[PDB]
Amino acid sequence: KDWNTVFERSINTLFLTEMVRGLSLTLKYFFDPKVTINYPFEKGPLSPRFRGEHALRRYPTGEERCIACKLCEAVCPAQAITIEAEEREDGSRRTTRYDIDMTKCIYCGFCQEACPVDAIVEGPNFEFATETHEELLYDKEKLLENGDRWETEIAENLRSESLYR
Amino acid sequence: RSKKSPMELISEVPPIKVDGRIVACEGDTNPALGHPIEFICLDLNEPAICKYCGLRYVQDHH
Amino acid sequence: IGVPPNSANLTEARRRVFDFFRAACRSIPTIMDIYNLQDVVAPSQLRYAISAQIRNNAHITDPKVIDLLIFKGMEELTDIVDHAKQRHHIIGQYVVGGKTDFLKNFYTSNYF
Amino acid sequence: SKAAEFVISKVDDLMNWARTGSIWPMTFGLACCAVEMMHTGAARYDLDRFGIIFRPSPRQSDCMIVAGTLTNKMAPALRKVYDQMPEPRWVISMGSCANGGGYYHYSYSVVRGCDRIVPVDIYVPGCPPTAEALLYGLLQLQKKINRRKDFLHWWNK
Amino acid sequence: NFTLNFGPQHPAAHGVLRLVLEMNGEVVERAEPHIGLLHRGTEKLIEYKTYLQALPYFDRLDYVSMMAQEHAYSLAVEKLLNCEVPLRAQYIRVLFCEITRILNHLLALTTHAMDVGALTPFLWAFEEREKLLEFYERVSGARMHASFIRPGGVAQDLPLGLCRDIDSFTQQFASRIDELEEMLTGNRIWKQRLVDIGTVTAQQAKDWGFSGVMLRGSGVCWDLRRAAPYDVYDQLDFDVPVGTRGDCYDRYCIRIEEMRQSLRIIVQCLNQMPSGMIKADDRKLCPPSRCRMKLSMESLIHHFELYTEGFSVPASSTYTAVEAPKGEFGVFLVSNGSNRPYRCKIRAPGFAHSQGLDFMSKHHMLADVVTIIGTQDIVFGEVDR
Amino acid sequence: GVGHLARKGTGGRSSVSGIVATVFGATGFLGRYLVQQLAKMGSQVLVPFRGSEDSPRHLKLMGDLGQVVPMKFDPRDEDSIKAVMAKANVVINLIGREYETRNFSFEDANHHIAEKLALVAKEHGGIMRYIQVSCLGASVSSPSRMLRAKAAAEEAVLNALPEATIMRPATMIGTEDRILNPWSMFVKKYGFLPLIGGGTTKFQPVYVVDVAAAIVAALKDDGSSMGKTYELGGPDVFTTHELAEIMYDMIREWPRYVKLPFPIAKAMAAPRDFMVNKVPFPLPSPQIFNLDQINALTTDTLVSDNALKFQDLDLVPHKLKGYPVEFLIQYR
Amino acid sequence: NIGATLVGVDKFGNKYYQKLGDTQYGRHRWVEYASKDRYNASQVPAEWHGWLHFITDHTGDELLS
Amino acid sequence: PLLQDGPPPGGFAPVRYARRISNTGPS
Amino acid sequence: KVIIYSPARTATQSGSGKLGKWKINFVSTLKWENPLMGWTSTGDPYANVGD
Amino acid sequence: MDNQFIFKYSWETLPKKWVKKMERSEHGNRFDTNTDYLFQLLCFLKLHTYTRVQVLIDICGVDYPSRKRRFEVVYNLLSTRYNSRIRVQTSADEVTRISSVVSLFPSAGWWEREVWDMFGVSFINHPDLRRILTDYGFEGHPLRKDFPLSGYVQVRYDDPEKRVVSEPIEMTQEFRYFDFASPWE
């Protein structure tokens, strides 16, 4: 080929002129602000639609919203919900047993979008790792405690997606 | 007050006075955040219970 | 190599059964070394085991069913030749092994 | 007990501090939870900050994160890998598939929970668990390690 | 020759990879991949679920490209139902499929470069991967397994700031790609470890069932978004990159170009997205609004019937394929007229690509086998269902 | 004594047998098999442990979910024992130690703990079956201090509860035994296997799985076992020489025996005896040169010709020549 | 916690800080835990959880009312 | 409602998608 | 031992759509209760195949 | 090029004794042939100038327990030159060996192995026909309609045996089948 082109490409071969261009790129990122977060102190951004730990809600009067319609147990693609119901002393349709297998749960939100009374919701909590398998077998009391503990945030989120759901 | 079951808590709310013979219960101030609309006939002497909320409605005058 | 074409009569099925039995018998030395079966089983007890399987599957008169049985047996033999299956598995399948039966079952459970 | 109640406690606290500050997990990535583990170790969360660095071999790792669907064909290998790690070892189950089978619980070729093959110390729920959920699981494991009293129990026996 | 085993259990290479290699010297003569370690019986589990209940299984098939499988399943159900999708929903599906394509390509390129020994681009690409998965977390409630694309329309609408944030991302993704290329494209080591490794002729690619980048690297201009267009892909302008040598380096240049073109398509979708409803108006097949189910009787009946029984697909069978990031992803759906699919085969491009590893690696160095495995961009969620 | 079992399944892992047992000392050798065979029938097992929480970790795999519940306890404290014994229709005692710790002597670890466990079961009426596991050579005249303590625990348990069966096995062989494994470890470390008695004493090795199955069968009896003392022994009457020959056969090494008369081995094991006291309470436990074991290996230990055995429970012990000793291939 | 504004205090004593971001963000919403004993990694109430994770723009004092 | 997510009036600003050249070095 | 039968029309509905199909009943009744959560346990593979 | 053209061309050019069922629709142009003419048909459709079908997309089986020929084997084909798809179907029972097409399409090997693993259909002249997806020593073909969803055997670790063992299946919570079928369908 041309002598000039041959000499120019031969210099790049022997002077490593395409590795210095990568070393400079790495060094530029060396002197640059980091993108890591202090997880214990600061958390990553989320959305009001986040599907986290399940919670059973209750009416502001103190009555649980669940009406034992079993419409969430039939839509659950993982069969993670088991519900037992009977007629309460007042004659109202309520659940005696409402337990969710969080080792079967796929956190898809189908139960939340199938509930006609907004009783079962997936709250914003995602930090509930346990040391025992049986602590992941949530029951009605555990779910109601979750709903009571996360009530304000769940209500605010449900207000947020009222415009969309 | 965790000792009170939801039955005892819903049994303490006084019935709502309604002037007409029928009342519509939605379950919340915002309709979209409650339960499906429920029309309750207030033509008895005992308070009439919503089958979703458990709230009781009673006729005011007659 | 390739799966043989489906047989047309019982004589061909018998020939394939004998060929498979001979291949399995020649495969006995390899298993005794791949798995530590030297001080475990005699080199003839296994042979008797394959013979017993062939004999208790010997009431079949459909050549297609016989060919499918031979193919499944060959697949099992090839799997055993490789280190695919665990050691106790073959020792759990390939080892040769008083009032009333009804009364014992009754004492056991209601579901016979 | 004039010094044992103090010196033994200090020597044990040193051991706990070392073991919590130097955790080398062996990531057993099998499924979509492997993507979440790789995101956790990325620059956004920097799992190397807390001393956690992943290791390829089981002879150099003191923790094992099972994150993915455990099938019947893979369990013999999972147990073999578990048996090769040194004695002070812990297992972290990540995701629904590793916890109890998950979305494939009723399958014919799925082990219904990695706790039927190896003893699990921490269960991280999710499908897939968030990267901060895995961070919380590792912090729970660290809190569990600080509860160990190895030298005191050895003294008391 | 001896019989050597690579089982990498560590996800420094896939994670469930099991190769039994027959090496003569340092060359490998036959590569037999042992699959079945991630076979979870997905195909049989589909037959026991409702058409709505079987949607989340497709998120976990190719867990690097989630929306791609949902799009194919939704299109198959629409084809068997003759359900028309509104234009806004189609634009949203195309937008989140081209976001998915960028996600898959970004993961594939850097998990392949990390196998070679380049650690820096991996974190840089996962930063943009996190930025993109934030959008996944916004429309749905899941970062990865988002059941967003659904057979009728789409699950739910876009938040207010999503378009602005996606535009802000697209203003800098070009420079991110430029940095990622500049770290690898010009490097002589990267060229020496990819050039002439994995050469496949077009005839071999056609015979072995190759699709996507594996097929287009051999000179075959075959894109399913231009040959059998779906949604609004025929209203968008984008080029189809085609290779010339068929080696691993062409698969990489094309995997760069397909992501630049994906950025282009994303920009066009953002600019041309119309207003309207996001689901089909046949509420016999789509859920009613939460305000309409609590106020109208027939809407509540539709909600109750849909969330227990679901819809019933008329008895028929069809094969629908889309251009997944890996290649051609197809679903063979058979319906008997009930609310549950009778049969649903999942045609995974990885199944046809890991099968051809035997002829691609023959007479290659042992260290050149990991590059051949990484250039096919295989995930075992789809390889063995 | 019927009422301690109610089958509610197919006899599998998820089945339900009406047995809720508290197995003390289940973190040792025999416990690992007894708990496994108890869990297979669907019986809930409570495993009280002491010290590190990693000791009962391997037992969680045996049950389905909640069938095995480890609970911390302290032998010195009495309310902990009552707490870990409340929900239990069956109590099995496996607590024992063959060497001496300055915290727990031979009498404390073998007799006093058994006494406390029997008494607590006495006040906490409701345990239908109680099993205490002594050693085959247990006798008041035995020179070995451990065996005498086990015998005294035998009379203590029988007096405190006449319905308590006393399964009394012999030297156990298994994956984690303390006779075959130390021998192989010594051989791989020094090349020769010492014989503290010249390979003369006769004893009856038994497979640990056979002993666990015997305890299980005694639990699932027709009521004959109550207040009996079985003597669980192996089929063949081996000796210290013939067992070492089998061990060499499995480990695949050329035999090399160093005969040692009783006095020299007794004096070589003596140093640890009078050095139990020191700045540290812990001290390296003996492996093959336990003075107590050397004294125990002076009188031949065989199953009594006029005592209950394996065949009185409809069980046949494994022949300790094939499968029982297959674990020795790890040193091969 | 330098050049930062304290948004509010919590019933457990946790302090919440905020810093203004321009184009790239970073350290703009975090907590200074009042405890030091491993801090349990989860001590944020539901009124402050949403503000920390950017779910809602309400501080949490305003979420109570 | 009638306020729905979409592009602002006039569309979004144009964005580069091709490779930007880098002529750095004396050679 | 199985039973081949054609399921009949339910008494609570007048529709006759789920008729004309034949099923094999395996008589799978061996079920019990999980003593941890009250779930229905089984050991029969043919518990729901015929249905 | 199109379903209207491919149907009419294959009607005329193809030998009549091969195909016995030709559906022409928008869901897909199908050809149903006997199992002893499958290889001939697929070789004709791979070499003819106007029907250059050079890509075998996949091979799937469908289980129909109510039919005499229980299994339906479907060959989805693609023609890159003419941008068209063709589907060819055959029918086989549990003890018939259909011809293998690995000679024509090298990619057919793994799909035929998967069909044999999942349904039990054997292929003549297949270089190696062994299970590809199920566990080693798996007994039964899971994708059959009579195969239980959870299978027959279950896997757990046996501590005394010191290995992972296989045991008969025993579910803690059985699969709950919900019958949503409507009588007014």
Ligand SMILES: NC(=O)C1=CN([C@@H]2O[C@H](COP(=O)(O)OP(=O)(O)OC[C@H]3O[C@@H](n4cnc5c(N)ncnc54)[C@H](OP(=O)(O)O)[C@@H]3O)[C@@H](O)[C@H]2O)C=CC1
């Ligand atoms: N060859 C054999 O093994 C023979 C065994 N036996 C008897 O069988 C029984 C068990 O067999 P094996 O399993 O071998 O016994 P191990 O010594 O192997 O296991 C001992 C068990 O007892 C517990 N233990 C020991 N000392 C104490 C104590 N002072 N306080 C509380 N718990 C204690 C241990 O808990 P930790 O580990 O936490 O101390 C462990 O769980 C023993 O009584 C033994 O004498 C009979 C004949 C021979």
Ligand SMILES: CCCCCCCCCCCC(=O)SCCNC(=O)CCNC(=O)[C@H](O)C(C)(C)COP(=O)(O)O
């Ligand atoms: C370790 C090795 C692994 C593999 C071991 C083998 C595992 C599979 C065992 C084989 C399984 C089968 O059933 S495969 C073989 C099954 N096929 C038949 O039994 C054919 C019917 N039998 C007859 O025709 C006659 O009885 C005949 C017996 C031939 C002789 O009798 P005659 O000639 O007088 O007629």
Ligand code: SF4
């Ligand atoms: S989130 Fe999905 S899998 Fe979990 S309980 Fe609800 S419906 Fe079932």
Ligand code: SF4
């Ligand atoms: S949580 Fe909702 S859907 Fe589920 S049973 Fe209760 S009311 Fe019905």
Ligand code: SF4
């Ligand atoms: S838990 Fe969910 S994300 Fe994790 S491996 Fe299982 S299906 Fe995949």
Ligand SMILES: [Zn+2]
């Ligand atoms: Zn109401």
